[PDB]
Design a protein around this nucleic acid. Sequence first.
DNA 1: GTTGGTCGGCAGCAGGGCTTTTTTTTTT
DNA 2: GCCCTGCTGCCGACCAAC
Lengths: 674, 669
Amino acid sequence: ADQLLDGLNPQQRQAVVHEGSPLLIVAGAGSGKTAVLTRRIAYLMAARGVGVGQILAITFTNKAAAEMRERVVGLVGEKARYMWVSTFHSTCVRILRNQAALIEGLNSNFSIYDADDSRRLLQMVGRDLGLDIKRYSPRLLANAISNLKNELIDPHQALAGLTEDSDDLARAVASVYDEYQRRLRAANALDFDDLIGETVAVLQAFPQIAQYYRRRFRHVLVDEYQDTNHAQYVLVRELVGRDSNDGIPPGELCVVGDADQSIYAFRGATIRNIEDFERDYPDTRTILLEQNYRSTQNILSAANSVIARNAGRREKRLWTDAGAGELIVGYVADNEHDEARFVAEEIDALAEGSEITYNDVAVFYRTNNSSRSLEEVLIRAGIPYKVVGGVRFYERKEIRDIVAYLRVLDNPGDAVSLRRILNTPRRGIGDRAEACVAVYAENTGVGFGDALVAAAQGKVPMLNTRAEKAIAGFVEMFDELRGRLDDDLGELVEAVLERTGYRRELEASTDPQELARLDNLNELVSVAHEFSTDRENAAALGPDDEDVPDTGVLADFLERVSLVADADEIPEHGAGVVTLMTLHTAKGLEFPVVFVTGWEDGMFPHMRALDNPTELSEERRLAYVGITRARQRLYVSRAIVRSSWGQPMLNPESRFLREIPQELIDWRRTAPKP
Amino acid sequence: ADQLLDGLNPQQRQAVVHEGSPLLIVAGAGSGKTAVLTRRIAYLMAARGVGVGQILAITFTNKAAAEMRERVVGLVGEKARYMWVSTFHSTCVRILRNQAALIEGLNSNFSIYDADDSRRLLQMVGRDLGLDIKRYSPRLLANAISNLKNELIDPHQALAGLTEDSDDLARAVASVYDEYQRRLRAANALDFDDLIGETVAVLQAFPQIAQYYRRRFRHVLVDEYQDTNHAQYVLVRELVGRDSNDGIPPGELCVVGDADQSIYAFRGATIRNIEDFERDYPDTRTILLEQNYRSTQNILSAANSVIARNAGRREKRLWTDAGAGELIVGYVADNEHDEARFVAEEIDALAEGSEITYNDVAVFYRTNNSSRSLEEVLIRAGIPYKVVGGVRFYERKEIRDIVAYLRVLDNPGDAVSLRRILNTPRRGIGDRAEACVAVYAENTGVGFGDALVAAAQGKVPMLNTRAEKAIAGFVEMFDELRGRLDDDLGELVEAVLERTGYRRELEASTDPQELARLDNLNELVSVAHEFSTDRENAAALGPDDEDVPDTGVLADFLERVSLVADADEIPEHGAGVVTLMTLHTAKGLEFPVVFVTGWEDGMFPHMRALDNPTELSEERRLAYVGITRARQRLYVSRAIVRSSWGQPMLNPESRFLREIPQELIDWRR
DNA sequence: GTTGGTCGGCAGCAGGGCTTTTTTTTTT
DNA sequence: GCCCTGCTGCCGACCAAC
């Protein structure tokens, strides 16, 4: 009864199902962000009754997937876990696992790369045509290769990359692109963005699999489609939205979102997709999302102001019947910004002064630089604490080494990731010679395979290791340790990996003031083995239906090695002791308590984001998304004298702090800083 | 406490202990300089403390910056890292606009330095080919654009509005070259640039940076002005100075007793900037200085008397005392400049070496290339002339040649140099060396070493890369045989040097600012220098060291290795140093013997600057800084009738020679 | 018939040869 | 002491118009 039409804003009631046509839905502020998605899945279950197992929706965050899954198993219920809904990268690995290698070219025992290893591989391959370590930095190479990968130039681009005429700024990476694809194929692994490029190329070049793998799933549902790059736009045009031309009615293809949450657009997202969706299936109605669950009249007015007047976008009057009052804290004055901290003093002092139960706080970052470091060295006073989003697992050098050693267990041939560093515990490896016996053997034809096992036994090249084949003995022992293996139990670093055990004993022996490093290494060993203990079988696999070819059998961490969606952990007793989270990761979470830096342009537009580029509106929009936030007590603060990070810099007065009105919402009143 | 309070009578360190802006000293050469600077900062240490940069300090270039930093590390207990106190305004502005953001696009970092002032030279050469006339000379006319920028005068607007005479080319090239370099600025090697300019405009721009600048690090210390101007004066008045505009507390601006040197008077530095503090910040009463250690009591007192000639009105009550004293020498040998001065300095130096070590024996010259073969003087005290080569260690210019004889006419012993050939702009990209092939190629040969693998076409290391053998063998054959056959005279552009200049000209035809363009002039002047050596080495009116051409060119190359080695290892023990002292380096070297010549007229001036009584005044103070640039002992000698090539320029009398009461300066002959 | 003009080229004769410093937005 | 170029004075030949 009420379950079909559970209590909500009648706005989504008139939005309703409207099954039988492509559907577009708008967003803005909270607007039950992805809660309308839960009501949509409830619609599909009950209001229309499409089924249970015919669901494959698409999202942009693993945390979003987890929260919507728990909401579904709560309200929708009926376990509903045999079938699943997964985020964009997780759908990528899904279509590369259930559809792993039922196709020519790539094989089912593939792999995935990361950011740092992509940078390292691109830098190494560029060293073959060296263009200085600083002229074309690996970060620059990575962003350029991504923003040329985002357009659909499939990996036969001897015409596409060479189509350029004259021009400057390194199209040579397009020449390196074919060799890059060759090297990654040598390890049978892909990158972030090409992980959809291969799929869309197959779906466009291989027609037999199309309208054939749809016999498994016919349903699709989209959220934050407003945040979308051209690559995944073509994907939704062909893969998840599926039907382009021809004509086959799928199961309720549907999208939601608006251009105002246009965060994550600088390095590739064509925000126009929602604007020009009439180029796609026109038979849908624009919705009017107007109300909210957790806003306030003052803050909603501020959001509408910071969305209204920068330049041309489409937006409507947005407000809610919720309670008003508690004007925004416009208290900008003298007495120092953050040089003498004094901000965390405001947060925590107001916390014990008021009824704050250490369960709610929110402050956003501005930069990936030492802003975090200073913010820490000023909140160390606050004892109730938990650091989040600081990048703390699966990037360090030593832990990457051990991750690689898990990875070298399988897939003989793993590019530069295969070696990572061969001379890892200062073995004594003469990194030379073998650094180029690879090109020696690739002149013969083999890239990095038999040449590696070409050792004391492999005198086929016999290319004078140094003069003494001692390095041949070392690499003999290396392939020996590669060969030995055991089951998914207490051996991942310890039992049959006694060489990594001796790595551990060496590092524990040396350990100059690296005691916390020792305990974090121990914690990572513990989590690695508990993943071999808590996940294992039964609890993870169980009697679950559906067919998976090879994942699970020593493919344990082959999946979830990426998990690249900014996972976050939310306790309840200490839910808001310290929740310093950078705004980019923040996507309208549940902390009414706000003390965000927010504004005062000169730092809010970054050192590169000067003058008037074509993305300042994106900055205003990310500020709007940050202020979307949650319920009352948004006790924001600012000063007037700016200086930070050693050498001082000055900060002009923002138009965003001025586009919000002066009288109807509170602004500077007196001299105290907070 | 006063653990850093050394033995010193009250007068000098009054500027160290007496706090307050209106403090001045009168100090000549042989003063505390950085000693008193460090003592003042240590007094402030006993006082307020670091505060990162509570009081700043303007200074001279790196020659002063390095020793200042050393004194800061040593004299006060604190280790280092107070703040940037690097080479005066040239680094002050650079570190300032790093965070300041008004108009910069790529952090400015411009210098109009040797390469870039040569870029100025080439662009005005183009304008000469295209606008009016030679306009005096291609050199020494950049003074116009310099003092145009130096005193921050308007680019060309009222200069043309001034309606001056036929010099409008200056206004044209000021309208140009103000925006011609505006698209992008890069590279930093010199001092002046527009860096000292256009930063007052930043201070005259948004006053937030100006307000905070003396809010977080308050004020600055000002050293010897010298390399300044009235525009630099208003900078120091406002760059760190507050001008009592909005700042509540006043400025702690004490001033060092800038003596009269004008080492860059050619580059522009007035006199009223130091002598006329009256129409400035409060009168800043001065204090006297007494202690000195440069020269003996006789020499020191006589120098005090000599500096008191007062041709230009100068505040001088300073006296300097010392220990022993002695009279000046009287050795003149009726010109014979080369032979006479060489034998005089040789006999005196040997007599000294029988008593005192050669570790700092040297001589002062007047910016000319003359005198006997340098081998004898260089082997007198071990190390070669480590004075100036325009820091020539840059690009391939100093190394490709200096290995050209390694590869042919002797063994290529410097295998690291050989790898540097393998690091050629050719061997890097053009005739690329294939690092991932070369490193192993020279690694091959078990008993590897030198270019032995490159030798014999690499028959033994043919286990190397196979398809690469085409290009690898071709570049190997080039680099070995083409150089090996080189047995001719080998100058100008030939052998392979013509190919080197050829592809330098190839990159010259492209965009880069003098890059591969100035080095063409550099190799032209280098072959001019080797021709000059041939004037005294190969065709030395009868060969000096040309026992068949091979050893002559090799002797030239060893002279070059000496020049490029300059200051190196083999510490200064025994036969320590021989150097040729120039005016522009006249600071830092103790120089405990002074066998200087040219104190007479004829060259001071040399018909360029004859009457010009003010110019004669700074030439007199040039003589003062020359005489005060000494240590320990000194016995100056001269020659008469300088018969040079046909122009004698007889100088029997000078306004410096015989105005002394002869208490010290008397020739006894 | 003849001296002044105009260049063309070359031996003497003298002015003139001086200059100090490099770093950071898509971030998932 | 020694070289580059500008300045200066000095042989030597072809044209002309008076």
